[PDB]
Amino acid sequence: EKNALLRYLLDKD
Amino acid sequence: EKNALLRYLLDKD
Amino acid sequence: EKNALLRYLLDKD
Amino acid sequence: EKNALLRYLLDKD
Amino acid sequence: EKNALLRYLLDKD
Amino acid sequence: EKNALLRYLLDKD
Amino acid sequence: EKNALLRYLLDKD
Amino acid sequence: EKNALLRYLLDKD
Amino acid sequence: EKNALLRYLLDKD
Amino acid sequence: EKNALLRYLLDKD
Amino acid sequence: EKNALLRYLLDKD
Amino acid sequence: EKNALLRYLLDKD
Amino acid sequence: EKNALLRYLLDKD
Ligand SMILES: C[C@H](CCC(=O)O)[C@H]1CC[C@H]2[C@@H]3[C@H](O)C[C@@H]4C[C@H](O)CC[C@]4(C)[C@H]3C[C@H](O)[C@]12C
Ligand SMILES: C[C@H](CCC(=O)O)[C@H]1CC[C@H]2[C@@H]3[C@H](O)C[C@@H]4C[C@H](O)CC[C@]4(C)[C@H]3C[C@H](O)[C@]12C
Ligand SMILES: C[C@H](CCC(=O)O)[C@H]1CC[C@H]2[C@@H]3[C@H](O)C[C@@H]4C[C@H](O)CC[C@]4(C)[C@H]3C[C@H](O)[C@]12C
Ligand SMILES: C[C@H](CCC(=O)O)[C@H]1CC[C@H]2[C@@H]3[C@H](O)C[C@@H]4C[C@H](O)CC[C@]4(C)[C@H]3C[C@H](O)[C@]12C
Ligand SMILES: C[C@H](CCC(=O)O)[C@H]1CC[C@H]2[C@@H]3[C@H](O)C[C@@H]4C[C@H](O)CC[C@]4(C)[C@H]3C[C@H](O)[C@]12C
Ligand SMILES: C[C@H](CCC(=O)O)[C@H]1CC[C@H]2[C@@H]3[C@H](O)C[C@@H]4C[C@H](O)CC[C@]4(C)[C@H]3C[C@H](O)[C@]12C
Ligand SMILES: C[C@H](CCC(=O)O)[C@H]1CC[C@H]2[C@@H]3[C@H](O)C[C@@H]4C[C@H](O)CC[C@]4(C)[C@H]3C[C@H](O)[C@]12C
Ligand SMILES: C[C@H](CCC(=O)O)[C@H]1CC[C@H]2[C@@H]3[C@H](O)C[C@@H]4C[C@H](O)CC[C@]4(C)[C@H]3C[C@H](O)[C@]12C
Ligand SMILES: C[C@H](CCC(=O)O)[C@H]1CC[C@H]2[C@@H]3[C@H](O)C[C@@H]4C[C@H](O)CC[C@]4(C)[C@H]3C[C@H](O)[C@]12C
Ligand SMILES: C[C@H](CCC(=O)O)[C@H]1CC[C@H]2[C@@H]3[C@H](O)C[C@@H]4C[C@H](O)CC[C@]4(C)[C@H]3C[C@H](O)[C@]12C
Ligand SMILES: C[C@H](CCC(=O)O)[C@H]1CC[C@H]2[C@@H]3[C@H](O)C[C@@H]4C[C@H](O)CC[C@]4(C)[C@H]3C[C@H](O)[C@]12C
Ligand SMILES: C[C@H](CCC(=O)O)[C@H]1CC[C@H]2[C@@H]3[C@H](O)C[C@@H]4C[C@H](O)CC[C@]4(C)[C@H]3C[C@H](O)[C@]12C
Ligand SMILES: C[C@H](CCC(=O)O)[C@H]1CC[C@H]2[C@@H]3[C@H](O)C[C@@H]4C[C@H](O)CC[C@]4(C)[C@H]3C[C@H](O)[C@]12C
């Protein structure tokens, strides 16, 4: 779940 | 480390 | 609705 | 989980 | 220098 | 790990 | 000019 | 035209 | 260092 | 056909 | 500069 | 066979 | 232009 959230947040970067 | 990166990214939120 | 609020809050991040 | 994440983000609010 | 590049890239997240 | 994060972020670049 | 090219390449990142 | 060729070549960068 | 970063980013171009 | 050949030749670049 | 960058990118091509 | 010879000749292109 | 770019790309070939 942490990777999923990170994936969402880093999408743009 | 993931929590640390998340804490940085969520800081403004 | 929880997703809708999360999406707004995570906006800046 | 969604509630747990919301509780964190809403903590300053 | 790595932190500076990371900072730049993470700016929108 | 800094290189690992960078490698991920630079991947579509 | 190097910064200008870098800015272009990194803008997706 | 040079910019158009550059954009094509840089598109995966 | 700018050249080093450019070389990496341009390597598949 | 010229674009097809160009794509082939460029698609290392 | 555009030719120099193009020569670099087309180097493999 | 023509494609095979072409692939070889175009390999450095 | 397409012939000129092709001649350049093929000149090793
Ligand atoms: C979640 C994301 C993409 C995963 C994928 O979909 O393939 C991956 C790519 C690079 C990863 C990061 C890098 O591996 C560097 C760090 C390694 C540590 O073990 C965790 C935090 C750490 C900062 C990682 C967080 C997360 O797992 C990342 C950001
Ligand atoms: C990293 C952050 C703050 C931790 C701290 O400052 O001590 C904590 C507080 C709320 C946490 C999240 C919430 O507990 C809900 C999720 C629980 C899952 O087990 C991991 C992802 C999950 C999405 C967590 C990611 C991260 O651990 C968070 C974001
Ligand atoms: C709401 C947001 C964006 C949805 C979208 O716009 O498509 C999505 C993207 C990543 C999601 C999170 C990630 O999937 C990781 C967690 C997964 C759990 O099932 C719920 C909490 C959890 C922390 C999710 C909460 C929310 O659904 C998120 C934050
Ligand atoms: C998670 C937080 C605190 C829970 C607690 O610790 O008591 C609770 C208090 C108010 C809640 C919100 C409010 O009840 C209003 C909405 C009600 C909907 O059923 C879900 C989203 C909704 C937006 C809720 C999301 C979340 O469950 C909240 C934000
Ligand atoms: C560069 C950035 C901001 C530093 C600041 O200006 O305060 C900092 C804040 C969160 C940091 C990350 C977190 O500390 C978690 C990881 C810790 C490892 O030691 C390196 C990678 C790692 C993924 C870090 C990379 C980088 O230094 C980050 C992204
Ligand atoms: C991590 C990435 C890929 C390395 C690899 O192929 O595994 C490498 C390629 C070029 C590197 C960068 C360049 O060498 C230029 C900078 C050199 C400094 O010493 C660190 C930051 C600096 C910005 C480097 C960060 C990172 O190590 C990079 C981005
Ligand atoms: C060009 C870009 C954005 C500048 C801007 O938009 O204002 C800036 C932001 C982060 C910079 C990088 C970081 O400062 C880390 C490195 C610092 C070294 O002095 C040069 C290479 C180096 C890798 C820098 C190259 C470039 O100037 C970057 C990539
Ligand atoms: C063609 C490309 C994308 C333009 C766009 O559509 O935004 C642009 C973005 C950055 C540009 C480069 C940078 O501006 C730095 C140089 C500026 C000089 O005046 C020309 C060559 C030069 C090396 C440029 C070549 C080309 O115009 C580039 C690569
Ligand atoms: C770093 C890379 C490879 C250098 C090498 O290893 O020989 C070189 C090849 C061609 C170079 C570019 C071309 O010379 C065109 C531009 C010349 C300007 O003075 C700097 C930016 C400029 C856009 C250069 C950036 C960088 O130095 C490049 C991209
Ligand atoms: C064939 C290739 C990729 C087309 C595609 O699938 O997107 C395209 C992308 C950029 C194109 C070039 C650019 O548009 C610049 C030139 C435009 C002229 O009208 C034809 C020659 C010209 C030099 C083009 C040749 C060819 O059509 C190119 C090289
Ligand atoms: C830079 C490179 C080599 C020049 C040299 O050998 O030193 C030259 C050879 C063929 C050139 C291309 C061909 O002349 C066809 C195009 C002509 C247009 O006027 C500019 C873009 C255009 C797509 C040119 C871009 C660049 O000047 C090229 C790619
Ligand atoms: C043989 C080579 C690669 C095929 C492959 O993917 O393995 C292919 C890629 C581009 C092809 C060429 C392009 O499709 C353009 C021309 C199309 C005509 O139908 C045949 C000659 C023609 C000049 C082709 C000859 C040959 O089949 C090429 C050169
Ligand atoms: C430009 C180059 C050299 C022309 C010359 O200066 O002699 C010529 C030699 C063979 C030509 C190719 C061959 O005639 C086969 C193809 C014929 C199609 O009508 C155009 C694309 C086609 C793939 C041609 C593209 C280009 O005009 C080529 C590659």
Numbering used by the authors:
A (entry chain K), B (entry chain J), C (entry chain M), D (entry chain L), E (entry chain H), F (entry chain I), ...: 1 to 13
Sentences from the paper on this structure:
Nuclear hormone receptors are cytoplasm-based transcription factors that bind a ligand, translate to the nucleus and initiate gene transcription in complex with a co-activator such as TIF2 (transcriptional intermediary factor 2). For structural studies the co-activator is usually mimicked by a peptide of circa 13 residues, which for the largest part forms an α-helix when bound to the receptor. HPLC analysis of the crystals revealed the absence of the receptor and indicated that only the co-activator peptide was present.
